[PDB]
Write a protein that binds this DNA or RNA. Sequence first.
DNA 1: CGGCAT
DNA 2: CGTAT
DNA 3: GCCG
Length: 330
Amino acid sequence: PAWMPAYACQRPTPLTHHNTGLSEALEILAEAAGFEGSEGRLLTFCRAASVLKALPSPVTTLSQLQGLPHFGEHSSRVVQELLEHGVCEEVERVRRSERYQTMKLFTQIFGVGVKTADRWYREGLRTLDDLREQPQKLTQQQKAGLQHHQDLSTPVLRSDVDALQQVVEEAVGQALPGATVTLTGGFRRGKLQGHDVDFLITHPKEGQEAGLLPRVMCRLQDQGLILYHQHAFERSFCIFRLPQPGSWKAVRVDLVVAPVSQFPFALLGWTGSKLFQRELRRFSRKEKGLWLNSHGLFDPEQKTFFQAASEEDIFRHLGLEYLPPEQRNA
DNA sequence: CGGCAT
DNA sequence: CGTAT
DNA sequence: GCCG
Ligand SMILES: [Cl-]
Ligand SMILES: [Mg+2]
Ligand SMILES: [Mg+2]
Ligand code: NA
C-alpha cells in the first residue's frame, strides 16, 4: 504494497479505520516502552500503530506489511502472531503484568507521570488507597487528580462539551468584549468522547488578549465552577464543577489564550492528534529546516516568523497537502 | 551511531 | 517534575 | 524500534 508515506502528517488518518486490534496491541507495547523509559521505542510502536490506521483495508496476511514504514522485525512479529493465533504472547505478558497495570493506574492520575509512578512503584505502592495513606508524597496537582479520579475517569461526552462551551463563552465575554472561544482537541477532530475539553481563546485585535486568562478564571471561580486550578499565564489546566441534573461532575478543561497573529498555529497544535503534531514538527525541522510550535513557524536562517492566517497557510508553506481536523487522527 | 516535538 | 496537543 |  500500500501507498504509505513515512510521516503521519503526509497521509489522512480518519476517525473510523481498520486494524484496531493490531494497532491496539502495538499501542500496548508503546505504553509499556514509555513505562520503562524508552521514548524511542514508544515512538516507533506508536508510528507503526498509526500506519495501520491509515491503510485502506484490513490487514489479513503478513504480506500486506511489505514496504510499510516503521515496520521492522519486532512490529512485524507482533502482527504475525496476532494474525496466526489471535494473540501475541509478548502483549499478553505485558498487559497482565503487575508493573504495567500499576503504572497505567498511577500515570492516569492527573499530576502523575512515568517518573513519579515508577518511583512509587519501586517504593512498593500499588493502589490509589496506598497513595491516599501517604499524602506527604503528593503535590497539590496530584491531590486534585486523586480526589476527583472517579469523575476524571468517566468519558467526557458532546453534551458536556456544549454545556462547558456555553459557560466558558459567558466568562470570556464578561472578561473581554469581542473575545472568542474555539473548541479544539479531540472533539474538533470528530471524536465522540474525550478525557477533557480543550478551548482556544483569542480576540481579533492584537494585544487585547493580554492578561485575559486570569480574568476568565476569576469569573469562573466566582460562579463556583472551578474545583482546581494551577494558581501571568496563557494555559490553564482546570478541573470544572460541571452542573448536571440535580448534581455535578468534575471535568478536566484546558484553556489556552493566543494573540490572533498566533491563532492558526495554536489551533493547529491544540487540534492534534498528539502524534500528528509530533510528526508535523519533525517534518518541519528535518525536511524544511523550519521550527514549528503553537506560537509560530520560525526560519532560523533568516530569523523570521511565517505570517499565517489559516491552518491551510501553514500546510502549504510546509509543502504538505492540507488535511482537515477529522483526518489528523494519527 | 544518535534522533526521536516543542 | 508536571501539563497541552 | 526503527531509520536518517
Ligand atoms: Cl470517539
Ligand atoms: Mg483533549
Ligand atoms: Mg487537554
Ligand atoms: Na498523568
